[PDB]
Design a protein around this ligand. Sequence first.
Ligand SMILES: Nc1ncnc2c1ncn2[C@@H]1O[C@H](COP(=O)(O)OP(=O)(O)O)[C@@H](O)[C@H]1O
Ligand SMILES: [Mg+2]
Lengths: 371, 66, 55, 55
Amino acid sequence: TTALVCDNGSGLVKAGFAGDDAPRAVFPSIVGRPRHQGVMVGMGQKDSYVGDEAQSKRGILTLKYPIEHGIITNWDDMEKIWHHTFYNELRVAPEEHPTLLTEAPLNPKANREKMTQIMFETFNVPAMYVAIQAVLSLYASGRTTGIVLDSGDGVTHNVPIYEGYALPHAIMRLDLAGRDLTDYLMKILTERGYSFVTTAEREIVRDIKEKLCYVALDFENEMATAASSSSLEKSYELPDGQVITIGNERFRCPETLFQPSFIGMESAGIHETTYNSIMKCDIDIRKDLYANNVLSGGTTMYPGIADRMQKEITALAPSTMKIKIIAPPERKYSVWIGGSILASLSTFQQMWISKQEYDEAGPSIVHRKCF
Amino acid sequence: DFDDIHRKRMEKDLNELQALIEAHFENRKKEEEELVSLKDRIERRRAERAEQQRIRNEREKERQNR
Amino acid sequence: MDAIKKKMQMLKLDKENALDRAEQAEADKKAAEDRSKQLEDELVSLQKKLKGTED
Amino acid sequence: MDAIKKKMQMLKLDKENALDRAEQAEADKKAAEDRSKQLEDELVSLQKKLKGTED
Ligand SMILES: Nc1ncnc2c1ncn2[C@@H]1O[C@H](COP(=O)(O)OP(=O)(O)O)[C@@H](O)[C@H]1O
Ligand SMILES: [Mg+2]
């Protein structure tokens, strides 16, 4: 039979059968209970709208993501999300399909063990396998080397790989991602008068960020230009009218990636953690990693980031090496495409964690040889 | 490996562009001119309805005025 | 619109690939010519050593 | 329109410039490589005649 390549993510759940080009169903991972009282009788009001249904009734819900930073903080809601994904968005019972979840690097063990225990006890799948979210993004590019920066919505991690041999001592995981950029944008919009507070209006700020923000090639020059002319002010129409005008908030929101001091984080930007991740590698594979830097994940879709990052790394790196940044147009679904490719391989067909194996060793089987 | 990138990229590099250009051309041709012509036709019918309404309103006001 | 963006992306992929190939070829030329000129210098020193041996 | 034409023409110009530059570089690389081969071949014989002279 065919395998189910699910990809929990944090912000958008992407799923679909193995062997295709794009995920079959992509929908936000939010579960929102209603918060008001409700007076109409017999309206058929449910107790929790999940997935894309709660992005249409969000006016009277309190949306809450079940995955904070890679890790899962609310297991009941995550189980609800998985149940919805299997039964309503794909309509395939899990009793007859292997599953291939994905997990960020350096995550707590208990999260992974609970994930496999749920998949084997509640949904009762035949066999499931957990894979690191960066190796798949490297599969999708058709490479076999390279250092991949997978800046998702929950957590940004940077896994270097050479000739198929991952370097476990050079993984640099940073917890700045799309959600923190949304919060920072929502916080700097208040400087013009627009106040978004409700958890429903966070979605509106996210839409503003997606449609308007861009990464500046040079930050100081843009700050000077936006403060003199008015060629940058782009307007946007809220879900009820009252258009708003975003000035130099456009390139200040995604600039947080390269200067995490804006949101008070100490660490260095995504332009310098990649160079540090490279320098921890051996001295003989640094040229190949320099030449095959891969971008993935949703948050790396800002217009103009593949040039800013290249300029920064070229500034840091030695002058002789060639710096090349691979930015495929299908960046958002790169991890899932790689997952489909991996699940479609014949050599991989014996790596699944078969159910009888789980019955013999318990949920701690995932840390064992079947990784 | 890296030899299917050609056979999955170069294909859509030209076929997709040409097909989308064809789709845009046919959609514009089907849509814009027909819509403008139909709107003009409906406008002429609307003007004729306006004339009929004026005539009927005037004749009824003429008779009923007592 | 829709197709226009994709066509621009194709034109940009061609841009990146052509530019990268040009730069790599230029680096190859620099390296090869340096190799040749160092070999020529070695040949010159051998000629001078032959001259001393002849003396 | 206006923007599409100028951007497309400029990008195609960039691709053509990179391609021709790469071709020129590769031609010079091949010529330098062959000349280097000639230098090696002559240097070996220079060494042989030097060795005979020294004997
Ligand atoms: N076109 C876009 N431009 C800018 N940011 C985007 C765009 N699309 C998605 N994002 C950001 O990326 C996030 C989605 O990232 P995603 O790759 O789905 O995360 P995950 O790894 O959990 O799947 C969204 O929250 C949004 O903030
Ligand atoms: Mg991801």
